Nucleic acid binder design. Structure first.
Ligand SMILES: [Mg+2]
Ligand SMILES: [Mg+2]
Ligand SMILES: [Mg+2]
Ligand SMILES: [Mg+2]
Ligand SMILES: [Mg+2]
Ligand SMILES: [Mg+2]
Ligand SMILES: [Mg+2]
Ligand SMILES: [Mg+2]
Ligand SMILES: [Mg+2]
Ligand SMILES: [Mg+2]
Ligand SMILES: [Mg+2]
Ligand SMILES: [Mg+2]
Ligand SMILES: [Mg+2]
Ligand SMILES: [Mg+2]
Ligand SMILES: [Mg+2]
Ligand SMILES: [Mg+2]
Ligand SMILES: [Mg+2]
Ligand SMILES: [Mg+2]
Ligand SMILES: [Mg+2]
Ligand SMILES: [Mg+2]
Ligand SMILES: [Mg+2]
Ligand SMILES: [Mg+2]
Ligand SMILES: [Mg+2]
Ligand SMILES: [Mg+2]
Ligand SMILES: [Mg+2]
Ligand SMILES: [Mg+2]
Ligand SMILES: [Mg+2]
Lengths: 160, 142, 184, 258
RNA sequence: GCCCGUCGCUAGUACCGAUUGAAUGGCUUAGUGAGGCCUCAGGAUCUGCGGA
RNA sequence: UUUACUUUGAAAAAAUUAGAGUGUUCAAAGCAGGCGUAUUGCUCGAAUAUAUUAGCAUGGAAUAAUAGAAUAGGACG
RNA sequence: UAUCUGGUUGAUCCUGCCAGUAGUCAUAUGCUUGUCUCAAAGAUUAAGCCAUGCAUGUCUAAGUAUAAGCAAUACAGUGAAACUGCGAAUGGCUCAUUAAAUCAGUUAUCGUUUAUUUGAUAGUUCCCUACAUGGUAUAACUGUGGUAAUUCUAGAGCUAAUACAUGCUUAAAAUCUCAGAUGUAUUUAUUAGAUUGAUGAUUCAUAAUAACUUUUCGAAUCGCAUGGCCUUGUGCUGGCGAUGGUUCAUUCAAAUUUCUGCCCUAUCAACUUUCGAUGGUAGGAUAGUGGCCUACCAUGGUUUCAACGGGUAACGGGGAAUAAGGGUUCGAUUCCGGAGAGGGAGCCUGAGAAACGGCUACCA
RNA sequence: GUGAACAGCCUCUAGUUGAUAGAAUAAUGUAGAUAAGGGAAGUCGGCAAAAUAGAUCCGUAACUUCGGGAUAAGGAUUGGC
């Protein structure tokens, strides 16, 4: 049952100290590394199962490989992702139509649509305006405070 | 200190520039500081040529801890002395004392001249060697 | 790893200290950068407190200040000619604080010509103003005729990842020339 | 050991909190905050042990999470928030304010105050420094930094803090003859007037204090808090006014009620 | 009267003792030396002359 | 000049120790609790002393030690 | 709570121990054991070995929900799973090591790091998106599996973000260079910081100048209420917060650090120093000081006022027993500090670990 | 010349080139060598052989008649330029 490792370049299996962003190992803790045995990249009689991906189609089809087709489980969630998928324009109001899954559960079929992320929203614009106005207001308040402190300093230096 | 540039590196006070463009008087601008706690900056430190980056006056160290007094028992190292700090330790059961001492290795600026004897005053500085945590601040050649 | 603790490094009386408190992370050391010349490669070291140091390996260019005109031009390091701490560093051209290097001198040539313009070694009337201050040391201007300016490294390339420095001048310059003539 | 401690064992808590010994193994560890660990009073202690509003820590959290309690004008729903010296704790329900001042015995006394002076609070100037961009600032005893302080404000002075804008309204100078609270040491909780300040360069500065009854005691400069001038404290003093009756006259005062 | 030592009987306790005795631990000389870490490189294949 | 010594003051976590108050039914304990009521509650406390090493600040100058001007290279102006 | 008595003799007075006597939160054991309150308890020997089960997880109104989960015109409630964040470095246990080490009191950081908390703080960025960018992205999930077996995971198909990676808008006023430059962060050099802030004291705070960066920050985030003006339009402004963010200060801390103080032992008198011992210069390394390490140099450093070595059935202290006074003995153990997780060593993540209910190796 | 050297090895002066020859290259010999892995199991017995070896530096125990043991043992280095 030992998985194959992509770049080992051996016909046998060896132990490697695996890291977070690699195959054959899911770290159970931040920074954890485990020494696990993985099978080399070269196929041999040691393999119980090999994995193939069809990358060129030819003559008569096989069952459950082209006759069957599994639909993608999820439509796009981000606004620009839905636009890029549906071949829309930027000014096309991607809210109007979204992939809608009907859940025939309680004779209601209340369609469950995804929430949309990065959507340009009046709330986002209000937040942006609030941030910009707070920034400029703080800058003005600091400038006037510095002005009045300099006035205090000049007044108390004028005592001579 | 005997042709101060006598080591393999150029000996100089950091961030103290002798500008060769300006035709000043000394041409050898020397930095110094008042160490504080009523310790007078010696004229030797004021007008010296040594560098001694560990000097309490012309160096980068500061005197901020305990002020000890001791008797010089060794001057055999370079810029470092060992002072003997004699004291009497009380033994309560016998209501009596016993003579004890603790040697304290102390860095001595070239501004001072010390010999065996020569009761000195030393001020605590930051660690400047494995064993040295004190700098000579008054020579008091008693 | 490397420890900077003093639980080893036997006491001043010469007594060998017994061990306690197996090596702690807060007293670790690390290996020297051993900065070389050319083909800049800077590695980030995650240090204590979440901060970051920059091990400069194989540094090619650095910012060097004249400090007589206050210019601090960026230049390329030719090589290492003197090291007070280790001659092997000179031999292996290791970049390190206080190392005496040679810089290209061409940015300094350009700045001097564009600012004063008085044929140092081979808006109109600003040089008329800044002409009296155009004389420089013979031992500095003579280096431009060879295109190699002596400089001292002031940054710590193993710590900051930079190889900044200053051009040698005056007594420091004379000292390092005397050492160079004695060792060469 | 490997990082900051998060627990506070009982019998290791500050004694001023007057915590029961056989209640549990732990005391409320003051969170990081304005004043200190040892010099603070956690809101849970102030709410359950000094006022008896809440019966336990659960009810303390229930009080705090419905935004009743307010420290220095801010809601402060943190159960172990380190409220310390001269903090204003206002409860809007049971509408009343308290000023955290030390009684004569050194404990944080329950000191009921009115809103017209709960508006502000006093702060001892821990340091005066130049901030970034050359902006001066004052660091007060409660960790507050206030920018552009009056250029005559020095360390060991006191400043009246608006506590609505957090600015300097008035400032008292550390000088001989000014009223001082003692905020540490053996004489913690005592109120008097400065008689002399001994310098002790490199060491700790000492200060001699004469209370109203002419008792004179010397204490370190670290734990003297200027609160005004003679007879004119900028704050409402607690019931004892820092008189420090001896045990004999305390017994006489107690037995005068018979 | 009391008494001392050898020599006999029995019991017990240490000591010496061939075994170039044995074991354990610290320190140490000379060797071999896992592993992680830094570094000289290397380049599966995932990529848009570049990157991981 | 340099000390020792001694006074005084701040310091020396809490718990523990001595110790004040307090009918846990007494007590060991604990820091509680007390007051008259048909309240829309008033109130006393959780003191005080101690560690006499070392350090810090401070008064004293007996006792004990230490140093001065002798080839004057002395002091004062 | 300042006390003795019996035993050498035929008798005596002594020396002198033996014995008695009393206490022990001082252990064990024998016999006995009705009541109430309180409650030490695998320390001693074996820091010996461990079956089994549990002891670290965590969600708000406010990071990410299309569960093909439940409920009565994008989602709106609740919400398993997972991604993200935070925590897991606290606690608890034990006393093996450890004798100037730890620890206690006392110091220092003008010698450093510090998640968090609290307070303050960011108009400066650009060489055809901002009414808001990319997959350079994937988990969960669907489906196809391997292995006897592990909290093993492979291949294939989607999908987000406060994950990852990018990336503008804020004029105005303003001085220098010969139109541009000037925020902050980094590095170097230089200047001021006086006799124009602070300290006993600084190359301090801070500012200025010229440059420099395998780019640091300068919200493309979230909830709830909707207001005012208005060319009533995809208008302009605008509230309370949450979260995140640079620097500073603060707090919780940490790391080093001054002075003085440890039991027995000379049947330990010299020790340390080639392989760092003591100091100097330079460098490297560190968060930072420092022989912490490296190179060259000097020959130092400790010691009869007991070094160094050895023992400890030694963790230190607060304390405990007994005590006229002076003392003797004990302190594994309720609090504080240290150290360790079978023995060592190495290291990842992280603010913080040389972590062990983390990993890697060797040993058993 | 090398080298400590009247050692061994090569050479100059001088002397000799004299030992019955030629051809083949079996066994067994005599003399000289080598050997995988093991390492005294061979044998009366390590006989024979092997291993070591100069010099420089370090380090050197029991025991002792204090003189030794001692080159004890055990390590390192060595050319050329
Ligand atoms: Mg600690
Ligand atoms: Mg007896
Ligand atoms: Mg009954
Ligand atoms: Mg045990
Ligand atoms: Mg713990
Ligand atoms: Mg500075
Ligand atoms: Mg150094
Ligand atoms: Mg003990
Ligand atoms: Mg032990
Ligand atoms: Mg103990
Ligand atoms: Mg034990
Ligand atoms: Mg403990
Ligand atoms: Mg540990
Ligand atoms: Mg065990
Ligand atoms: Mg470990
Ligand atoms: Mg366990
Ligand atoms: Mg643990
Ligand atoms: Mg010869
Ligand atoms: Mg053979
Ligand atoms: Mg062989
Ligand atoms: Mg053999
Ligand atoms: Mg045989
Ligand atoms: Mg045989
Ligand atoms: Mg035989
Ligand atoms: Mg033979
Ligand atoms: Mg030999
Ligand atoms: Mg022999």
């Amino acid at each position: 049952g030992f998985p194959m490792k992509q770049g080992v370049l051996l016909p046998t299996r060896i132990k490697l100290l695996l890291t977070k962003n690699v195959s054959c190992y899911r770290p159970r803790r931040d920074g954890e590394r485990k020494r696990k045995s993985v099978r080399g990249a070269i196929v041999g009689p040691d393999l119980a199962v090999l994995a193939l991906v069809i990358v060129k189609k030819g003559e008569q089809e096989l069952e459950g490989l082209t006759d069957t087709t599994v639909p993608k489980r999820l439509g796009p969630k981000r606004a620009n992702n839905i636009r890029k998928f549906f071949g829309l324009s930027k000014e096309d109001d991607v809210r109007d139509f979204v992939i809608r899954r009907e859940v025939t559960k309680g004779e209601k079929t209340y369609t469950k649509a995804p929430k949309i992320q990065r959507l340009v929203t009046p709330q986002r614009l209000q937040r942006k305006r609030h941030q910009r106005a707070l920034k400029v207001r703080n800058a003005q308040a600091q400038r006037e405070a510095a002005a009045e402190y300099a006035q205090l300093l000049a007044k108390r230096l004028s005592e001579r | 200190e005997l042709t101060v540039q006598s080591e393999r590196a150029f000996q100089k006070q950091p961030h103290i520039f002798n500008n060769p463009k300006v035709k000043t008087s000394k041409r050898t601008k020397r930095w110094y500081k008042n160490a504080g706690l009523g310790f007078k900056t010696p004229k030797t430190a004021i007008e010296g040529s040594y560098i001694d980056k560990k000097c309490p006056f012309t160096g980068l160290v500061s005197i901020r801890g305990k002020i000890l007094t001791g008797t010089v028992v060794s001057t055999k190292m370079h810029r470092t002395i060992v002072i003997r700090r004699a004291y009497l330790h009380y033994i309560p059961k016998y209501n009596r004392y016993e003579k004890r001492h603790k040697n304290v290795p102390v860095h001595v600026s070239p501004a001072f001249r010390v010999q065996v004897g020569d009761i000195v005053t030393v001020g605590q500085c930051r660690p400047i060697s494995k064993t040295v945590r004190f700098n000579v601040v008054k020579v008091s050649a008693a | 790893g490397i420890s900077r603790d003093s639980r080893h490094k036997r006491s001043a009386t010469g007594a060998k200290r017994a061990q306690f408190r197996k090596k702690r992370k807060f007293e670790l050391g690390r290996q020297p950068a051993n900065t070389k010349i050319g083909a800049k490669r800077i590695h980030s070291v995650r240090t204590r407190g979440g901060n970051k140091k920059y091990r400069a390996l194989r540094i090619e260019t650095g910012n060097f200040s004249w400090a007589s005109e206050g210019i601090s031009k960026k230049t390329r390091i030719a090589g290492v000619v003197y090291h007070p701490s280790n001659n092997e560093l000179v031999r292996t051209n290791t970049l390190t604080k206080a190392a005496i290097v040679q810089i290209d001198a061409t940015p300094f040539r350009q700045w001097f010509e564009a600012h004063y313009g008085q044929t140092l070694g081979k808006a109109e009337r600003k040089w008329a103003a800044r002409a009296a201050s155009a004389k420089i040391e013979s031992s500095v201007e003579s280096q431009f005729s060879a295109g190699r300016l002596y400089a001292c490294i002031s940054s710590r390339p193993g710590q900051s990842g930079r190889c900044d420095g200053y051009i040698l001048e005056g007594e420091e310059l004379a000292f390092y020339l005397r050492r160079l003539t004695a060792k060469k | 050991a490997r990082g900051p401690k998060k627990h506070l064992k009982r019998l290791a808590a500050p004694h001023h909190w007057l915590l029961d010994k056989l209640s549990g193994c732990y005391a409320p560890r003051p969170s990081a905050g304005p004043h200190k660990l040892r010099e603070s009073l956690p809101l849970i202690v102030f709410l359950r042990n000094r006022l008896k509003y809440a019966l336990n820590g659960r009810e303390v959290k229930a009080i705090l999470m419905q935004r009743h309690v307010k420290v220095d004008g801010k809601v402060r729903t943190d159960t172990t928030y380190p409220a310390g010296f001269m903090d204003v704790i206002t409860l809007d329900a049971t509408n009343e304010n308290f000023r955290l001042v030390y009684d004569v015995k050194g404990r944080f006394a329950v000191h009921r105050i009115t809103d017209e002076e709960a508006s502000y609070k006093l702060g001892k100037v821990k340091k005066v420094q130049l901030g970034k961009k050359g902006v001066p600032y004052v660091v007060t005893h409660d960790g507050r930094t206030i920018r552009y302080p009056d250029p005559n404000i020095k360390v060991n002075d006191t400043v009246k803090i608006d506590l609505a804008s957090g600015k300097i309204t008035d400032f008292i100078k550390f000088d001989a003859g000014k009223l001082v609270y003692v905020t540490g040491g053996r004489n913690l909780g005592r109120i008097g007037t400065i008689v002399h300040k001994e310098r002790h360069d490199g060491g700790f500065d000492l200060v001699h204090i004469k209370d109203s009854l002419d008792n004179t005691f010397v204490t370190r400069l670290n734990n003297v808090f200027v609160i005004g001038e003679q007879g004119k404290p900028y704050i409402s003093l607690p019931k004892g006014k820092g008189i420090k009756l001896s045990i004999a006259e305390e017994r006489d005062r107690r037995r005068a009620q018979q």
